[PDB]
Amino acid sequence: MDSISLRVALNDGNFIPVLGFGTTVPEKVAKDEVIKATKIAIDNGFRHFDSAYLYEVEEEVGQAIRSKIEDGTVKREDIFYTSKLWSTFHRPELVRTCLEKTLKSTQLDYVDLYIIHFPMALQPGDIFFPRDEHGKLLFETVDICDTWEAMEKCKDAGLAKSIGVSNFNCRQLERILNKPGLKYKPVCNQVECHLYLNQSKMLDYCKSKDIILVSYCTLGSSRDKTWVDQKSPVLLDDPVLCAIAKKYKQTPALVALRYQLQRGVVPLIRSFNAKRIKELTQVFEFQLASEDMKALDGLNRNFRYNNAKYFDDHPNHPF
Amino acid sequence: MDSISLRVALNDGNFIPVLGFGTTVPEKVAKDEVIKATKIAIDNGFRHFDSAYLYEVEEEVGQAIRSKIEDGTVKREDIFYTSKLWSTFHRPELVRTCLEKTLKSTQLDYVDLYIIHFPMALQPGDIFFPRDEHGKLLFETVDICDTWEAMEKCKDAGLAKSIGVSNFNCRQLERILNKPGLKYKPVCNQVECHLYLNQSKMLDYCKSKDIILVSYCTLGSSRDKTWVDQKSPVLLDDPVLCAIAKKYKQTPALVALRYQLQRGVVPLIRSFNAKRIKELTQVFEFQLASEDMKALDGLNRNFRYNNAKYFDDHPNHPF
Ligand SMILES: NC(=O)c1ccc[n+]([C@@H]2O[C@H](COP(=O)([O-])OP(=O)(O)OC[C@H]3O[C@@H](n4cnc5c(N)ncnc54)[C@H](OP(=O)(O)O)[C@@H]3O)[C@@H](O)[C@H]2O)c1
Ligand SMILES: NC(=O)c1ccc[n+]([C@@H]2O[C@H](COP(=O)([O-])OP(=O)(O)OC[C@H]3O[C@@H](n4cnc5c(N)ncnc54)[C@H](OP(=O)(O)O)[C@@H]3O)[C@@H](O)[C@H]2O)c1
Ligand SMILES: C[C@]12CC[C@H]3[C@@H](CCC4=CC(=O)CC[C@@]43C)[C@@H]1CC[C@@H]2O
Ligand SMILES: C[C@]12CC[C@H]3[C@@H](CCC4=CC(=O)CC[C@@]43C)[C@@H]1CC[C@@H]2O
């Protein structure tokens, strides 16, 4: 069967498809394009979809998914849908409210994985990034351990099959793992990970705790100018990556992706192009040799495309 | 990660690694060879091990598995162990007794999948195939539906995560699916399936019921003279199979195996040879084209290497 549909074990007894499909829509691209791409991803064997409250497209993604359930292509159970809790709902009493909005929007009866988008709380309200009239960002110091307890209850309530975090550093992660009364451990930490920021320490830390590293910007991001510095290196053009790709008669994208899979990372990818969507499904058809992995490991330069500078000087900034 | 370690969904919410490693030891081969092979299989990414009470090697296999858990190579959760209920324990009150012997032998705290080895009951006792002094096989007519209820309780008791059957024909399968009060549906039907006996009807039946077909003798069996007719065709020598293997620069074994995976079968293989064990791990590195699948589909000749003639004329003989 579709090898990219196959699953890996989560520490709570659940299983996640090994390859995920992101749903962020680029600034100048139309939101209906995500419906097109999602249906195509499903047709190509993609069973893991990553979204978020912040993305404002959960209505569209849920629509693409249900149409495929409707026409008998898949069952809810075949789909693994991930969503994320936004910073303005970090207050314990607001966590489930955020999730219930996602459920209402997607029309799915539960999310397979619900995660904390960032370890930073912002003032409750209707704006994603609330600032005062002088531009200061209105944040709060809600303890992650408190928001985490609210996340555990959403799992107990059956609204989320699994719970995890995103953009957490080791200190923040340790804070939750050592929390007294901890009932459910985070099943993953979704962070930026690619050839220029391979996260070997975080990967080692997660392995020792049975937490999986789910990577984003795996192919060097979408270079969306609203959030990616245009003077940053283009990952897929890297000479060493292109030489190796050439050596295996594969594309750089496939080599950048395979590298992650080979090191134990569950990667997220995104393409609104039908040829490229199909192309990524062949990542299991080859295998990098030790020497080549060591080569790619050497491309690391601790470079972030996602600095989270839109969070200004939040006392809890992970980076 | 090891693509042969990846999992497929079972109809009860569990997941099974896509490629299984059998543990039967050939007549003239030493039982300690299975400990060697199992450790090597684990080192190579095999996570699904198929055994049975009848095989008399559960003590050895459990030993190989635990050593790998003990040195930190895997966790119990990483391993999927299958065992089978022997015919002499078909009486409802004896089912759990058989399972508890397996648990005691393997020293695992539960089996991931427990299945009915054959749909034929034999008289209780210490001999696998009890016969009278005149030679007649001492069988019983215990209803499979009754033994099945005993299997459901072992699942409710937590002793077996999943339950299934083996060597059942469609009638016997339908008998259980239509049983009144059925609580748990069989997650699989482990039967003989290869190029000369592809089981297309059974495969279709299973697909419609969400029952997976787990195949054995996938490579044409071990040709063990105690149970395989030496005048039977050698599957891996088949001209058409060798031509196709040649066309993909792959071995016949890999082509015989890939064919099963491509049609939705979860295959079982077995090799006590370290080179061949490693060889089978590359089955995801290529893909047969439609025309080639149709070619291989044509090799079918409804030929069984496993006639179960050791069950003589049991009224419930599946074949
Ligand atoms: N948790 C967080 O804080 C966070 C942050 C950022 C992202 N994410 C997740 O990660 C997902 C992906 O992020 P991203 O889009 O910024 O990064 P990305 O996956 O690294 O890059 C996406 C870009 O790669 C291109 N691409 C896809 N397949 C390709 C192929 N085979 N060859 C060449 N190029 C290919 C796409 O172009 P085309 O469309 O033309 O194919 C697209 O522009 C997001 O949708 C989201 O779900 C999470
Ligand atoms: N449920 C049932 O009633 C039932 C019945 C029979 C079997 N089974 C299960 O199926 C498992 C396998 O059965 P089996 O051994 O009879 O049949 P099989 O898997 O079809 O054949 C095993 C033979 O194939 C050879 N082989 C393995 N890899 C090879 C490769 N890459 N190239 C060439 N040859 C290769 C092995 O030789 P080497 O060792 O030299 O590599 C071995 O002799 C059993 O252990 C058992 O778990 C279940
Ligand atoms: C920069 C931005 C806030 C942060 C967003 C970004 C879109 C992409 C994105 C995806 C994430 O999951 C993390 C937050 C970010 C990085 C948004 C585009 C406009 C908005 O102001
Ligand atoms: C033939 C036999 C009983 C049936 C056994 C066979 C070993 C292989 C085997 C594996 C199975 O799982 C089904 C039963 C069989 C086919 C045994 C070897 C000696 C014994 O008498």
UniProtKB/Swiss-Prot annotation, chains A, B:
Active site per the UniProt annotation: 55
Binding-site residues, substrate: 117, 227
PROSITE patterns cross-referenced by the UniProt entry: ALDOKETO_REDUCTASE_1, ALDOKETO_REDUCTASE_2, ALDOKETO_REDUCTASE_3
Protein location: Cytoplasm
Expression sites by tissue: In brain, highest levels found in olfactory bulb. Moderate levels present in cerebellum, cerebral cortex, hypothalamus and pituitary. Low levels present in amygdala, brain stem, caudate putamen, cingulate cortex, hippocampus, midbrain, and thalamus.
Regulation: Potently inhibited by the nonsteroidal anti-inflammatory drugs (NSAID).
Cellular component terms (Gene Ontology): cytosol
InterPro entries: AKR (IPR020471), AKR1C (IPR044482), Aldo/ket_reductase_CS (IPR018170), NADP_OxRdtase_dom (IPR023210), NADP_OxRdtase_dom_sf (IPR036812)
Stored CDD domains: AKR_AKR1C1-35 (cd19108)
Key words, A-Z: Cytoplasm, NAD, NADP, Oxidoreductase
GO molecular function: aldose reductase (NADPH) activity; androsterone dehydrogenase (B-specific) activity; androsterone dehydrogenase [NAD(P)+] activity; bile acid binding; ketosteroid monooxygenase activity; steroid dehydrogenase activity
Modified residues (Blocked amino end (Met)): 1
UniProt binding sites for NADP(+): 20-24, 50, 166-167, 190, 216-221, 270-280
Quaternary structure and partners: Monomer.
PANTHER family reported for this sequence: ALDO/KETO REDUCTASE (PTHR11732)
Role this protein plays: Besides being a 3-alpha-hydroxysteroid dehydrogenase, the enzyme can accomplish diverse functions: as quinone reductase, as an aromatic alcohol dehydrogenase, as dihydrodiol dehydrogenase, and as 9-, 11-, and 15-hydroxyprostaglandin dehydrogenase.
The name this protein goes by in its record: 3-alpha-hydroxysteroid dehydrogenase
Lineage, top ranks: Eukaryota, Metazoa, Chordata, Craniata, Vertebrata
